[PDB]
Design an enzyme around this catalytic site. Structure first.
Site, PDB file in Angstrom:
ATOM      1  N   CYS A   1      38.098  40.196  40.593  1.00 34.11           N
ATOM      2  CA  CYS A   1      39.549  40.239  40.440  1.00 34.11           C
ATOM      3  C   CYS A   1      40.038  39.701  39.098  1.00 34.11           C
ATOM      4  O   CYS A   1      39.759  38.555  38.749  1.00 34.11           O
ATOM      5  CB  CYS A   1      40.205  39.418  41.568  1.00 34.11           C
ATOM      6  SG  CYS A   1      42.017  39.409  41.474  1.00 34.11           S
ATOM      7  N   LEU A   2      40.783  40.536  38.366  1.00 32.47           N
ATOM      8  CA  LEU A   2      41.383  40.131  37.104  1.00 32.47           C
ATOM      9  C   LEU A   2      42.603  39.238  37.301  1.00 32.47           C
ATOM     10  O   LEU A   2      42.958  38.462  36.423  1.00 32.47           O
ATOM     11  CB  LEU A   2      41.767  41.379  36.295  1.00 32.47           C
ATOM     12  CG  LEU A   2      40.602  42.255  35.808  1.00 32.47           C
ATOM     13  CD1 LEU A   2      41.076  43.710  35.539  1.00 32.47           C
ATOM     14  CD2 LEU A   2      39.921  41.619  34.575  1.00 32.47           C
ATOM     15  N   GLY A   3      43.217  39.340  38.475  1.00 35.34           N
ATOM     16  CA  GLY A   3      44.423  38.579  38.768  1.00 35.34           C
ATOM     17  C   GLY A   3      44.171  37.254  39.446  1.00 35.34           C
ATOM     18  O   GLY A   3      45.121  36.584  39.830  1.00 35.34           O
TER      19      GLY A   3
HETATM   20  C1  HEM Z   1      45.052  36.466  46.961  1.00 34.30           C
HETATM   21  C2  HEM Z   1      45.227  37.399  46.012  1.00 34.30           C
HETATM   22  C3  HEM Z   1      44.154  38.405  45.555  1.00 34.30           C
HETATM   23  C4  HEM Z   1      42.984  38.741  46.122  1.00 34.30           C
HETATM   24  C5  HEM Z   1      42.331  38.175  47.401  1.00 34.30           C
HETATM   25  C6  HEM Z   1      42.370  39.758  45.305  1.00 34.30           C
HETATM   26  C7  HEM Z   1      41.146  40.346  45.529  1.00 34.30           C
HETATM   27  C8  HEM Z   1      40.509  41.260  44.687  1.00 34.30           C
HETATM   28  C9  HEM Z   1      39.180  41.788  44.883  1.00 34.30           C
HETATM   29  C10 HEM Z   1      38.259  41.446  46.059  1.00 34.30           C
HETATM   30  C11 HEM Z   1      38.910  42.624  43.869  1.00 34.30           C
HETATM   31  C12 HEM Z   1      37.613  43.428  43.632  1.00 34.30           C
HETATM   32  C13 HEM Z   1      37.612  44.713  44.447  1.00 34.30           C
HETATM   33  C14 HEM Z   1      36.270  45.411  44.319  1.00 34.30           C
HETATM   34  O1  HEM Z   1      35.315  44.878  43.705  1.00 34.30           O
HETATM   35  O2  HEM Z   1      36.139  46.522  44.874  1.00 34.30           O
HETATM   36  C15 HEM Z   1      40.072  42.638  43.000  1.00 34.30           C
HETATM   37  C16 HEM Z   1      40.209  43.373  41.846  1.00 34.30           C
HETATM   38  C17 HEM Z   1      41.341  43.452  41.078  1.00 34.30           C
HETATM   39  N1  HEM Z   1      42.486  42.667  41.179  1.00 34.30           N
HETATM   40 FE1  HEM Z   1      42.801  41.287  42.690  1.00 34.30          FE
HETATM   41  N2  HEM Z   1      43.206  40.010  44.244  1.00 34.30           N
HETATM   42  C18 HEM Z   1      44.325  39.217  44.370  1.00 34.30           C
HETATM   43  C19 HEM Z   1      45.378  39.134  43.488  1.00 34.30           C
HETATM   44  C20 HEM Z   1      45.539  39.912  42.345  1.00 34.30           C
HETATM   45  C21 HEM Z   1      46.650  39.843  41.406  1.00 34.30           C
HETATM   46  C22 HEM Z   1      47.809  38.816  41.495  1.00 34.30           C
HETATM   47  C23 HEM Z   1      46.460  40.807  40.474  1.00 34.30           C
HETATM   48  C24 HEM Z   1      47.312  41.192  39.239  1.00 34.30           C
HETATM   49  C25 HEM Z   1      48.162  40.360  38.640  1.00 34.30           C
HETATM   50  C26 HEM Z   1      45.230  41.476  40.798  1.00 34.30           C
HETATM   51  C27 HEM Z   1      44.682  42.507  40.063  1.00 34.30           C
HETATM   52  C28 HEM Z   1      43.447  43.057  40.247  1.00 34.30           C
HETATM   53  C29 HEM Z   1      42.909  44.139  39.455  1.00 34.30           C
HETATM   54  C30 HEM Z   1      43.598  44.873  38.274  1.00 34.30           C
HETATM   55  C31 HEM Z   1      41.521  44.402  40.009  1.00 34.30           C
HETATM   56  C32 HEM Z   1      40.495  45.456  39.545  1.00 34.30           C
HETATM   57  C33 HEM Z   1      39.421  44.753  38.716  1.00 34.30           C
HETATM   58  C34 HEM Z   1      38.375  45.762  38.268  1.00 34.30           C
HETATM   59  O3  HEM Z   1      38.152  46.763  38.974  1.00 34.30           O
HETATM   60  O4  HEM Z   1      37.779  45.545  37.187  1.00 34.30           O
HETATM   61  N3  HEM Z   1      44.683  40.902  41.939  1.00 34.30           N
HETATM   62  N4  HEM Z   1      41.021  41.778  43.510  1.00 34.30           N
END
Ligand code: HEM
Length: 399
Positions: A342-344
Site C-alpha cells: 500500500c502506497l497510502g
Molecule cells: C486502512 C487503510 C488501508 C488499507 C488496509 C489498505 C490496504 C492496501 C493493500 C492490502 C494494498 C495491496 C493490494 C494488493 O497487493 O493487491 C494496497 C495498495 C494500494 N493502496 Fe492502500 N490501503 C489503505 C489505505 C490507502 C490510502 C489512504 C491510499 C491513498 C491515499 C491508498 C492507496 C493505495 C494504492 C494507490 C495501492 C496500489 C499500490 C500498488 O499497486 O503498487 N491506500 N492498499
C-alpha cells in the site's frame, strides 16, 4: 453456486468458502474468515465458490505468494472495466510507485497532519452535542474523501459529485455502471490534469501530471488512471477500518480506558487494531503451472491471498483474536506485502491515529446504541454496515 472442480485439484483440498458471504458472518467478519485457520484446514485450499479459486490460509504462504510476482501475477487481482494504475501491473511498476510515493509519502503526510486534525476536530465537534451518531455514515464516510481533496488541491464544492462517483464504483445504486462511473471520474480529472500540466502547483495532481515514465512525460491516460487509484484506494479501506476500530472501542471499555489514561499508547494501539481488524482480501493469477508447498497450481488458476489472514494466524501472533496494545511484535500484512505494498499506508495510519486521539479526548465515553446488533459485510474490502453510537453529551469536552 459451486463451479465444476478442475481435474488437477484433489478433493481433500476442497473447502467451499465464499469470500462474499462467509458462513456465520454474524459472529464478525474476521472470525468468519478465521474458520480457514482451524486445525482441520490445510495451508492451501480450493473453493468451488465464485468461479473456483485457491485460498492461501496462513501468513507464511500469503507472504510468499506476494513476494513471488513471477508466478503470482497482478494482471487479474480480483475474484471473480478496471484499469487503475499501478494495481494491475507487475520497471514500469517501480517508476509509477516512485511517483505515487512523491505525493503520499511520509514527508507529505507529515505536512498534512495538522490539516487532518483540524478536519477530524470539526467533524467530531459537529456530532458531539447530539449524544449519538452512526459513526460509519457521520464521521467515517466524510473523512477520507475530504482528506483526498486536501491532498489533491480540489475544492470542497466538488465533494458530493466525486463521492457519488466513487460510491457507484463500490456500492452502485444502479444509476451508473462501473464503466460509466469510471469514465465520469476521468471526465472530471482530465481537464484538471491538463490544466496543472501547464500551470502546476504542489498538490498531488500537479505532481502526478508532471511526472516522467521511461524517459518521457507521463501520458494523460496514465495520469488519470494513477489519480483515480489514489482517490479510490483510500476511501472504503479507511471508512471500514475506522468503523471496525470504533466498534471495538465501543464494546471494550477497558481498552478504551487504557487509551484515555495513556494517550501515548495510541500509535501502538493503531498498529494492533490494524492487525486484529485487518480487512482486505486481494488475489493473483498463476502465470504458469507451478508446484507451491506440495500443491499443483495450474496456469491461469486464480488464488485469493487474503491480507486479512496473515496477522490473525496464530503462527504469527499468539492469541490472535485478543487485542493487546502492548504486543512486543505486531505481525501483519494489513497493507499488503511485496511489490504492491500500500502506497497510502502512511496517510492511513495518520488518519487513524488523529481520529482516535481526537475522538478519545472529546467523546471519551461512548457505547453501541442499546439493541443494535452490528452487521459486517465481506468481500475484497470487508466492512461495517452501520455503527450506531451513543454517549452522554455532559461527559464530552467542547472545542
Ligand atoms: C486502512 C487503510 C488501508 C488499507 C488496509 C489498505 C490496504 C492496501 C493493500 C492490502 C494494498 C495491496 C493490494 C494488493 O497487493 O493487491 C494496497 C495498495 C494500494 N493502496 Fe492502500 N490501503 C489503505 C489505505 C490507502 C490510502 C489512504 C491510499 C491513498 C491515499 C491508498 C492507496 C493505495 C494504492 C494507490 C495501492 C496500489 C499500490 C500498488 O499497486 O503498487 N491506500 N492498499
Amino acid at each position: 453456486n459451486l463451479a465444476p472442480l478442475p481435474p488437477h485439484v484433489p478433493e481433500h483440498l476442497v473447502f467451499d468458502f465464499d469470500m462474499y458471504n462467509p458462513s456465520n458472518l454474524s459472529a464478525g467478519v474476521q472470525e468468519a474468515w478465521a474458520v480457514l485457520q482451524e486445525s482441520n484446514v490445510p495451508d492451501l485450499v480450493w473453493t468451488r465458490c465464485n468461479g473456483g479459486h485457491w485460498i492461501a490460509t496462513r501468513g507464511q504462504l500469503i507472504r510468499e505468494a506476494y513476494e513471488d510476482y513471477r508466478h503470482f501475477s497482478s494482471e487479474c487481482p480480483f475474484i471473480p472495466a478496471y484499469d487503475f494504475i499501478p494495481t494491475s501491473m507487475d520497471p514500469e511498476q517501480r517508476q509509477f510507485r516512485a511517483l505515487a510515493n512523491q505525493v503520499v509519502g511520509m514527508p507529505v503526510v507529515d505536512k498534512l497532519e495538522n490539516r487532518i486534525q483540524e478536519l477530524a476536530c470539526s467533524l467530531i465537534e459537529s456530532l458531539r452535542p447530539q449524544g449519538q451518531c452512526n459513526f460509519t455514515e457521520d464521521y467515517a464516510e466524510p473523512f477520507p474523501i475530504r482528506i483526498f481533496m486536501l491532498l489533491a488541491g480540489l475544492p470542497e464544492e466538488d465533494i458530493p459529485h466525486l463521492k457519488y462517483l466513487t460510491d457507484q464504483m463500490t456500492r452502485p445504486d444502479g444509476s451508473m455502471t462501473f464503466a460509466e462511473a469510471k469514465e465520469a471520474l476521468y471526465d472530471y480529472l482530465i481537464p484538471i490534469i491538463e490544466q496543472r500540466r501547464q500551470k502546476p502547483g504542489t498538490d498531488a495532481i500537479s505532481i502526478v501530471a508532471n511526472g516522467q515514465v521511461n524517459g518521457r512525460p507521463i501520458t494523460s491516460d496514465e495520469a488519470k488512471r494513477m489519480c483515480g487509484l489514489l482517490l479510490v484506494g483510500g476511501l472504503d479501506t479507511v471508512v471500514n477500518f475506522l468503523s471496525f476500530s470504533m466498534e471495538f472501542l465501543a464494546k471494550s471499555p477497558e481498552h478504551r480506558q487504557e487509551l484515555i489514561e495513556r494517550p501515548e499508547r495510541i500509535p501502538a494501539a493503531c498498529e494492533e487494531l490494524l492487525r486484529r481488524f485487518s480487512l482486505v482480501a486481494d488475489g493473483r493469477i498463476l502465470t504458469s503451472d507451478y508446484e507451491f508447498h506440495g500443491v499443483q497450481l495450474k496456469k491461469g488458476d486464480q488464488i485469493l491471498l487474503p491480507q486479512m489472514l496473515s496477522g490473525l494466524d496464530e503462527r504469527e501472533n499468539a492469541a490472535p483474536m485478543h487485542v493487546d496494545f502492548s504486543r512486543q511484535k505486531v505481525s501483519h500484512t494489513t497493507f499488503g506485502h511485496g511489490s504492491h505494498l500500500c502506497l497510502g499506508q502512511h496517510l492511513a495510519r495518520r488518519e487513524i491515529i488523529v481520529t482516535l486521539k481526537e475522538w478519545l479526548t472529546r467523546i471519551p465515553d461512548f457505547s453501541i446504541a442499546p439493541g443494535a446488533q452490528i452487521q459486517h459485510k465481506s468481500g475484497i474490502v470487508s466492512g461495517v454496515q452501520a455503527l450506531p453510537l451513543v454517549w452522554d453529551p455532559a461527559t464530552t469536552k467542547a472545542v
